[PDB]
Amino acid sequence: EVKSTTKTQRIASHSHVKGLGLDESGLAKQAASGLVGQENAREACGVIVELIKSKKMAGRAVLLAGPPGTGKTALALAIAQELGSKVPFCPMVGSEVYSTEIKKTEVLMENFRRAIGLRIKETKEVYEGEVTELTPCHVIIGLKTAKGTKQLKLDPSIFESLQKERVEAGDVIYIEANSGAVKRQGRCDTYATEFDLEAEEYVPLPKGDVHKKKEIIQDVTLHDLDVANATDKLRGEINKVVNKYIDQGIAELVPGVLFVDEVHMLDIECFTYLHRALESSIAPIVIFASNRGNCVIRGTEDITSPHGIPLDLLDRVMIIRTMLYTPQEMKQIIKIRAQTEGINISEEALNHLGEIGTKTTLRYSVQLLTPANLLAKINGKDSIEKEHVEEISELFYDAKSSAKILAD
Amino acid sequence: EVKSTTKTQRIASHSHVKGLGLDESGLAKQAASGLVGQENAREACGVIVELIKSKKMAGRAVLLAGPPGTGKTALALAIAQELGSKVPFCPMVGSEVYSTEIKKTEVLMENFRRAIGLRIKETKEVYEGEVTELTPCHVIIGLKTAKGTKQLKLDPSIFESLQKERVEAGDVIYIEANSGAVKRQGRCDTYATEFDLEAEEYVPLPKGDVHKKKEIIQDVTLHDLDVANATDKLRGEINKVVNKYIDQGIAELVPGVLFVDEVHMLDIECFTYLHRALESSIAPIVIFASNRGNCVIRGTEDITSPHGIPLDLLDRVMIIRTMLYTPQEMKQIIKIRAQTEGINISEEALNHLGEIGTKTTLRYSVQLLTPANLLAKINGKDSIEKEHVEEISELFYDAKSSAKILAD
Amino acid sequence: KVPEIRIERIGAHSHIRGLGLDDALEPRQASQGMVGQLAARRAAGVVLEMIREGKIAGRAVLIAGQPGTGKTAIAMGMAQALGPDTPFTAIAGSEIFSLEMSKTEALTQAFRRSIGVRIKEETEIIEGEVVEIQIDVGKLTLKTTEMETIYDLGTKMIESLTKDKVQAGDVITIDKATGKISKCPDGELQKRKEVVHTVSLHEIDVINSRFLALFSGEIKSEVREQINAKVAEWREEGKAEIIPGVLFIDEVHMLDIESFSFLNRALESDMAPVLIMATNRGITRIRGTSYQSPHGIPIDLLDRLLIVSTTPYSEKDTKQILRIRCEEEDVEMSEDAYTVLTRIGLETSLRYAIQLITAASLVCRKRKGTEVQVDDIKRVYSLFLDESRSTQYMKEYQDA
Amino acid sequence: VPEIRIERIGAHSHIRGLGLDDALEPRQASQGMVGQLAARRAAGVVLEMIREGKIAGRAVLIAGQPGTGKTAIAMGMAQALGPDTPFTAIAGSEIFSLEMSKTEALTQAFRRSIGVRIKVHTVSLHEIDVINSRGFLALFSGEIKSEVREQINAKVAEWREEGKAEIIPGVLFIDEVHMLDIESFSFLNRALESDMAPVLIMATNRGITRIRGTSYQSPHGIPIDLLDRLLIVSTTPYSEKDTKQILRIRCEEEDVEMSEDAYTVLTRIGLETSLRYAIQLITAASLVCRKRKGTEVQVDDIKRVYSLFLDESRSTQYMKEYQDA
Amino acid sequence: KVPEIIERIGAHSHIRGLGLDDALEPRQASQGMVGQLAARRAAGVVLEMIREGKIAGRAVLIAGQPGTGKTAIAMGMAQALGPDTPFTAIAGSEIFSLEMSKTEALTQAFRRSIGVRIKEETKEVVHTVSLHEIDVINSFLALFSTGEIKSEVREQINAKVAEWREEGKAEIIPGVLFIDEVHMLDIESFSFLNRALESDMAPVLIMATNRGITRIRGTSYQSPHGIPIDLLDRLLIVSTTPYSEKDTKQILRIRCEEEDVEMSEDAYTVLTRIGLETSLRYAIQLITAASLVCRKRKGTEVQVDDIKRVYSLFLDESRSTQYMKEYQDAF
Numbered sequence A, B: 001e002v003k004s005t006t007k008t009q010r011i012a013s014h015s016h017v018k019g020l021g022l023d024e025s026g027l028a029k030q031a032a033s034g035l036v037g038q039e040n041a042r043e044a045c046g047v048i049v050e051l052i053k054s055k056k057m058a059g060r061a062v063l064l065a066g067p068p069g070t071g072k073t074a075l076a077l078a079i080a081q082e083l084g085s086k087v088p089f090c091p092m093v094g095s096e097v098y099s100t101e102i103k104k105t106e107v108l109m110e111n112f113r114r115a116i117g118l119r120i121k122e123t124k125e126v127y128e129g130e131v132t133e134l135t136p137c138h139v140i141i142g143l144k145t146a147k148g149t150k151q152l153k154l155d156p157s158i159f160e161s162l163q164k165e166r167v168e169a170g171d172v173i174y175i176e177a178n179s180g181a182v183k184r185q186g187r188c189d190t191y192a193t194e195f196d197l198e199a200e201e202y203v204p205l206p207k208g209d210v211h212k213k214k215e216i217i218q219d220v221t222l223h224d225l226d227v228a229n230a231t232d233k234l235r236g237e238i239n240k241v242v243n244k245y246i247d248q249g250i251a252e253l254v255p256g257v258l259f260v261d262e263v264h265m266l267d268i269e270c271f272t273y274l275h276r277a278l279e280s281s282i283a284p285i286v287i288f289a290s291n292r293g294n295c296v297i298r299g300t301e302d303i304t305s306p307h308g309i310p311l312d313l314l315d316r317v318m319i320i321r322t323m324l325y326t327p328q329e330m331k332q333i334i335k336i337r338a339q340t341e342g343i344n345i346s347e348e349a350l351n352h353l354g355e356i357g358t359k360t361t362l363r364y365s366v367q368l369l370t371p372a373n374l375l376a377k378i379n380g381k382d383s384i385e386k387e388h389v390e391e392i393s394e395l396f397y398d399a400k401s402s403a404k405i406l407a408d
Numbered sequence C: 001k002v003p004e005i006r007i008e009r010i011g012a013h014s015h016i017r018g019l020g021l022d023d024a025l026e027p028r029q030a031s032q033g034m035v036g037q038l039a040a041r042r043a044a045g046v047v048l049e050m051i052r053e054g055k056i057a058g059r060a061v062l063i064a065g066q067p068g069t070g071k072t073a074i075a076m077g078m079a080q081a082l083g084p085d086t087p088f089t090a091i092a093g094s095e096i097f098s099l100e101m102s103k104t105e106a107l108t109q110a111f112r113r114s115i116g117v118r119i120k121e122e123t124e125i126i127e128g129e130v131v132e133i134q135i136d137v138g139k140l141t142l143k144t145t146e147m148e149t150i151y152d153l154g155t156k157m158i159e160s161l162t163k164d165k166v167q168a169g170d171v172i173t174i175d176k177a178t179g180k181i182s183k184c185p186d187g188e189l190q191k192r193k194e195v196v197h198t199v200s201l202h203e204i205d206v207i208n209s210r211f212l213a214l215f216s217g218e219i220k221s222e223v224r225e226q227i228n229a230k231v232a233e234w235r236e237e238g239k240a241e242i243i244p245g246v247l248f249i250d251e252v253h254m255l256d257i258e259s260f261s262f263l264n265r266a267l268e269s270d271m272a273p274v275l276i277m278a279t280n281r282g283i284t285r286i287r288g289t290s291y292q293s294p295h296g297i298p299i300d301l302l303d304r305l306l307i308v309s310t311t312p313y314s315e316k317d318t319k320q321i322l323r324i325r326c327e328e329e330d331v332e333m334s335e336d337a338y339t340v341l342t343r344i345g346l347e348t349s350l351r352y353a354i355q356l357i358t359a360a361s362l363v364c365r366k367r368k369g370t371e372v373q374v375d376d377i378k379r380v381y382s383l384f385l386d387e388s389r390s391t392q393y394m395k396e397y398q399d400a
Numbered sequence D: 001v002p003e004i005r006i007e008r009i010g011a012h013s014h015i016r017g018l019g020l021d022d023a024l025e026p027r028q029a030s031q032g033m034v035g036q037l038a039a040r041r042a043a044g045v046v047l048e049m050i051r052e053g054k055i056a057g058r059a060v061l062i063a064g065q066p067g068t069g070k071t072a073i074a075m076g077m078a079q080a081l082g083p084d085t086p087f088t089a090i091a092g093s094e095i096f097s098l099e100m101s102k103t104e105a106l107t108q109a110f111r112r113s114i115g116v117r118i119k120v121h122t123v124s125l126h127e128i129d130v131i132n133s134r135g136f137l138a139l140f141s142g143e144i145k146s147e148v149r150e151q152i153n154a155k156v157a158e159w160r161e162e163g164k165a166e167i168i169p170g171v172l173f174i175d176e177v178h179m180l181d182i183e184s185f186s187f188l189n190r191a192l193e194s195d196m197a198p199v200l201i202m203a204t205n206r207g208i209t210r211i212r213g214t215s216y217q218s219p220h221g222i223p224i225d226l227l228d229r230l231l232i233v234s235t236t237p238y239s240e241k242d243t244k245q246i247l248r249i250r251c252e253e254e255d256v257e258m259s260e261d262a263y264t265v266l267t268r269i270g271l272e273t274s275l276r277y278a279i280q281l282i283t284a285a286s287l288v289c290r291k292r293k294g295t296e297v298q299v300d301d302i303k304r305v306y307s308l309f310l311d312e313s314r315s316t317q318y319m320k321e322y323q324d325a
Numbered sequence E: 001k002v003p004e005i006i007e008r009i010g011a012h013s014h015i016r017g018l019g020l021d022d023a024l025e026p027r028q029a030s031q032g033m034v035g036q037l038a039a040r041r042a043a044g045v046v047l048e049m050i051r052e053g054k055i056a057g058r059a060v061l062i063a064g065q066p067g068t069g070k071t072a073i074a075m076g077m078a079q080a081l082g083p084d085t086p087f088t089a090i091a092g093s094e095i096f097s098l099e100m101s102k103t104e105a106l107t108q109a110f111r112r113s114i115g116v117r118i119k120e121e122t123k124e125v126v127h128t129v130s131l132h133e134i135d136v137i138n139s140f141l142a143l144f145s146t147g148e149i150k151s152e153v154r155e156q157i158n159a160k161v162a163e164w165r166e167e168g169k170a171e172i173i174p175g176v177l178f179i180d181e182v183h184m185l186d187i188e189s190f191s192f193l194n195r196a197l198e199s200d201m202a203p204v205l206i207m208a209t210n211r212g213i214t215r216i217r218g219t220s221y222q223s224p225h226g227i228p229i230d231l232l233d234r235l236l237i238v239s240t241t242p243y244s245e246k247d248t249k250q251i252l253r254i255r256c257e258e259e260d261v262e263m264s265e266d267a268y269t270v271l272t273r274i275g276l277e278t279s280l281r282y283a284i285q286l287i288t289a290a291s292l293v294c295r296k297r298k299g300t301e302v303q304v305d306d307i308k309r310v311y312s313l314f315l316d317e318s319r320s321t322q323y324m325k326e327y328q329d330a331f
């Protein structure tokens, strides 16, 4: 159908997160699905997830109060991943509401529509089968199903998409019969070994015909719907078509997670808008993030509130604190980030990077991985060493030390 | 005739006042015309009434400078009532110039047009006569005058109005011929004793006939005509109509009294309009009130002036000081309020209420009458006692004490 | 053309059924789900007396005290004691500042959704003992203390009635559900159930005017004018009656001098609701000006205020409120855990103690337990923090 | 087009010019003016400038404590410039009006100081404008057109060309000039650069005061560009005999007969508080004496009126002392 | 219907590339730039990032006292990306305009920082032109007697550029956008910078500042360098140390050779002192006044007494402000 309008830059840093990582009893195992350490906040996050599941969070919201670089955005992404398969996640900072070209209403509008999602489900007679043979000519391809091997005429673009998915003979994949698109789902159990089982990464022979009736589920958000149409009228007509879809029965509305970092920089009018949006049956679980204490509410003068949140909304909010990482954990998070980025690094370099991390922040240490890798590649090596990390830490500085140096 | 739009609640607390209570030489008696104490300020007000009647207030203004609850509004209303029988009084607090829908100009003009009164004198056919009999058949009514008894058909609405006025046989009252309405003038002088005189609460038999041509005097306000047209277009039609009426010579436009409490809350913007308004030939005597000394003019940021009034308009302002009340004065004031409210109160109850008054304020003690009366009524008494006053004092608080408790 | 048909949704005051004082203005300790705070409740009762006897117009009520003492509870009690169908709005002072609507629109909406109209619709109910189930589409032999008359009714309705309790009940509403209670069929055969349902103005505006549309608010003046005229029309003809409700404004200090004037202008009217404000601040600046007045309220309005004071709760009172809330939320709890929760509530806040209840219940449900224990309470106390603890911890962090 | 403040209220009707004469030598009695010889002489020098034509581009400023006669000097120079010269006497606070913006208010003030003589009738140009602009209370009912003024200016040019009218540059007085902000000062500076421009007198009672609309402090709250083109005239406070004579002439003007002891107690009262408060007390005392069937105002009437109406210092201090609790 | 077609002042004409080379190893003499070895090395690392494609979603900040050549470093990095890499060098104060709002100013800067190559067969002549030039084409006292580029022209130009990119004769080169004195931007413009950087065809962003912990303009919170946190953890911060005597001597020599000036050795020493405790750019300004003075007395070289005359004629910033400040204190 349509593409995805998710800002992957804000999520790419949190790419090793694969959930919260709690056992059946809810205890934290200190290492699971990327997350390491920070047990208390993870248990509270799991409790929040359980509250969301039973719909006990009628209008209540979550607030994460901790120092920068303690995993607040990571925890929010972990909640969003724990709530389901592909529950949408839209991180934002308060500063974006101050735009010279678009009203604050439009910014909060769009960042709310990016959070709640729509699972579209529909049974389609798609070409779900095993690629037995491939003859690129008009790309006559043999697809084997419960019926048998049928020869299908495809397009060179479809074959290029098949190459993009890295498809080899013996893969259970569906090629669209209405338009034509290859999406990898797994391999085939006709060529399955002992460790490859059915109803898993290996799929048995597709039951039925080559035009197999399979329930395709596509995850979208209303923001992609608005950008799909090349104004309030556009949003309204998306509104009505979504309502028609849900009454039809082929659509399901899922509440996402809306992360709000730097909560103290939202105007007191924006807080009222957030409170009004938190009053609907369908609404994302609004998670705030704060690192400033008793603060003046923007839009008012000489008034002081905890975390810069008015006492109206703040009383409907639960507070989870995030503690500072220890050096031993420091090393594990930075190792996970390096491994996910494919940046081999030595143990003593990891130690020194952990010292740098506990000195100033963790985001700083995370950004100090690509420059070290490039300085290693330039020198004619493959793995980062202690000397390289020291050199790259001397070359670049963080905001705090740079401001301190410029003050003198 | 149009109805009245006077804000009766703002003058409800000042209903016992009849005039200034001044004797023939201008001195002030201790208690007269529903006014107790403040002899100095009352003599000053009488002098000001003399100046107004002598056309010596050709662009000047008054300012009542006194602590809260010292009869400033009472003295303004006394001046308004001493100016004439039905001179308009338009109380105001400056805060209402701060409105969202209507501008400051609209508010100030509306409050100015509530003080420029108009005595209409209309020549109409009238039925001033003695109601001799009321035989329902259209209720034909016999009216007696010097000529004799004339039987006329009466409208049901006029009969209902007569019943409201409580008119029975042997009462010389006034009816309307062209429109139809009943006003109770009094009883016939057939029972004229030494205290029942003519052209008074007892009216003799009307010489002439039942059907007469009378000059009816009626009080109206310009803003009353404004509310009788449902912008500046309607107002323009109103001024044209008023000009036609005054040039016909059948009416007179009377200047009223326009009270402005909390004068420091008006912007320097409003003071220019006030100054250019009171300079006009036909303008109300604008009387200010204040209870703070050197204050910053609102609109500027550092220019402090007496009473928050610019030094230009303050030049043409006379200042009258209103003093505090002694305990016996306060007792008399509260007793007058209770008598006008139909509430019976004991002696030691009055003593305790006066103590409360000298402790915080007078208006607070006046307000603590209805709650005490209802508490006494529920308890099962006929008059307020000391216990009821004490209990209603422990239940309800005042601003200063409540803020003091909220301090810690 | 005119079609017709928050606090109770969250259910934070579902146990408040009236003020409970009664006894001719004498507070009862237990009463109707309100414990402690005798003086404020009795002052509230005097306020109800004033409202009932028509001597409240031109005035308003102010409630001062520390947060977590029950100001909104007192307001809800007064609203319920005023009338069983009395509308009750409970807005906050900061709420009127909105991106969408101006302060005028916000305050007008809050005002209108506090005054109610009781629509009295005399539906024609068909009551009668079903002596015989007449087949079918046909008629229905219904009898009462007046006569026995056949009323035409559908076949599927007959099939539903045969399942219903015969002959006990069968009190149908016209083209509506059949109420089976007992043999109540009495008087005439065609009775009038005058359903008196009260809705405030604002639902009438929204229904007359324009799911997720709440994501993608101003009411046009024409709709307001037509409803203002036509409500007076129904009042003249006699179909409905106008009921003054209660409008509650929490944290009144957040309002400014530019809307206090609107409050003064609006409440000076006949069909104006009771106005209640709440505050926890002493002398503070008036927003929009430079002068300081008590409770952030201008002196002109404040002189018309009946000020009540709420005292902080004690041990027994807090334990009782916690018990009431646990009963209302289907939560089972032990005595020592109750004492620990009461200590936590008095140490930090009662609202935080109320918040902890659902989290403790869920943490107990997870371990396949029925009664929430002290360990569950301590766990949820460690997980979620309150205002003071987070502020203190993270301010200690921010000391640099 | 169709054709035909300080005088209406009074308080300056007795001043028929400065009265110095004798080739710029102040006369003690003169034409109503009493005392303040230095300021009167400086004003006379200003008249000499205006008559010779050496005032173009400059303006006059008058400093001093309130109640010393700045408006008196302005009215004197207005009268000395001719028998029917216009004289506008606006304040610094009257350019903040709900209806008219500062531009419109200042333009109206300027056109109320450019008279036209027709053959003799002398009328203000802004009065001509208001006549050519469409109820016994129309003062209640600004923004008097934008094209009508241009049409009237063209017609005035024609009336100058064929000889039916004469242009008279009047005097525009701005009391409390520190009220104006840097916005209006620029308008004043730009408007003075015209051939038909009135003499501009400002008055102030304030020393170093922050310029309104900016952050920098300047003398008298006037921007330096205007302050370097000003003829500053300082007025000293009055002494006993001067105010006694002022009260005498004022009472003679408003038909009040008073005794000598009442005169000296009134003079002392005015010395302590202001000339304007003492002047205000006179009418109230006269009305009090009329009630008591007295023709000559005694000193006990002064006692009664001084006890009745309060002056500004007492009124402010009483309630400042109120806020101690 | 659509046709086609910093250095004007020439304060950096001597700058030809960064000069480090040798596989990210700073050369002391190099090509134009002198000294600041750590800054050169960090600039080279950032250059490698830009070259491979690992700079998207990130930007560069240079912090140092004024007169340390941070604009020179930006110019060098722009040169080393290619001989036709566009380079804009706006200031923070230049976005507040009478005719253009902050939106238009920042959009104009960003579009002026993107280049496109035009190959034109006659031989495919390559002409490198910035987008903003193409926009201003589709619209001699024009600089005096609006400048608002209309929206429809912008969308038409974007569609045209996409078409010409797909056709295969034009290619888009991301340039370098430099914002001097970034602390003078407000939060409403920092948000625009944050949102515009999230694009595929986004120029490299360099911001320069010379002030430490400062209040963010538009807010009331103290932040380092007056930059909001949401943009501060996506920044690569390099700091330039103040020059020393030999480096300033070398830069003065290079600038004099660039501007056609012949100065004696002791004159070079005195001018180095000038640039030593007042500012180096002040000395750069003084060289041209000294050259003009020397021609008045019919000389070919510039002597030390010419410097001593020019220094008395024109004043540096510190002396000129201290004069008036102490006059005002004495007033």
Ligand SMILES: Nc1ncnc2c1ncn2[C@@H]1O[C@H](COP(=O)(O)OP(=O)(O)O)[C@@H](O)[C@H]1O
Pocket (backbone or CB within 6 Å): A013, A014, A015, A017, A034, A035, A036, A037, A038, A067, A068, A069, A070, A071, A072, A073, A074, A075, A333, A362, A363, A366
């Ligand atoms: N407990 C944790 N487990 C795994 N990764 C973490 C943890 N805490 C932080 N991180 C990682 O550190 C990086 C810094 O992001 P984050 O901590 O969210 O910044 P901030 O705390 O300022 O919002 C993220 O990529 C995140 O994945």
Ligand SMILES: Nc1ncnc2c1ncn2[C@@H]1O[C@H](COP(=O)(O)OP(=O)(O)O)[C@@H](O)[C@H]1O
Pocket (backbone or CB within 6 Å): B013, B014, B015, B034, B035, B036, B037, B038, B067, B068, B069, B070, B071, B072, B073, B074, B261, B333, B362, B363, B366
């Ligand atoms: N001198 C007086 N005589 C009679 N009643 C008075 C007098 N002074 C005050 N009152 C009554 O007491 C109350 C005092 O309030 P008010 O005088 O309006 O205070 P303020 O004038 O400061 O606003 C009023 O309701 C008024 O009716």
Ligand SMILES: Nc1ncnc2c1ncn2[C@@H]1O[C@H](COP(=O)(O)OP(=O)(O)O)[C@@H](O)[C@H]1O
Pocket (backbone or CB within 6 Å): C012, C013, C033, C034, C035, C036, C037, C066, C067, C068, C069, C070, C071, C072, C073, C074, C321, C350, C351, C354
């Ligand atoms: N006297 C009381 N009786 C019963 N419940 C109470 C009482 N006081 C407070 N509560 C309960 O405490 C909870 C929180 O009090 P609340 O009124 O919200 O505090 P605030 O006064 O800050 O609004 C409410 O849900 C209310 O039911």
Ligand SMILES: Nc1ncnc2c1ncn2[C@@H]1O[C@H](COP(=O)(O)OP(=O)(O)O)[C@@H](O)[C@H]1O
Pocket (backbone or CB within 6 Å): D011, D012, D015, D032, D033, D034, D035, D036, D065, D066, D067, D068, D069, D070, D071, D072, D073, D246, D275, D276, D279
């Ligand atoms: N030299 C003078 N001659 C005549 N009258 C004077 C003289 N000085 C002051 N007065 C009178 O004093 C009164 C107040 O002076 P005024 O000019 O209003 O003071 P200000 O300079 O504050 O405006 C005026 O009515 C004026 O007639």
Ligand SMILES: Nc1ncnc2c1ncn2[C@@H]1O[C@H](COP(=O)(O)OP(=O)(O)O)[C@@H](O)[C@H]1O
Pocket (backbone or CB within 6 Å): E011, E012, E032, E033, E034, E035, E036, E065, E066, E067, E068, E069, E070, E071, E072, E251, E280, E281, E284
């Ligand atoms: N390393 C260097 N190489 C060459 N020129 C330099 C160097 N450092 C500074 N300069 C010169 O110093 C002058 C000031 O540099 P610039 O960064 O543009 O302004 P500022 O340094 O004052 O912010 C420039 O003309 C530049 O030529």
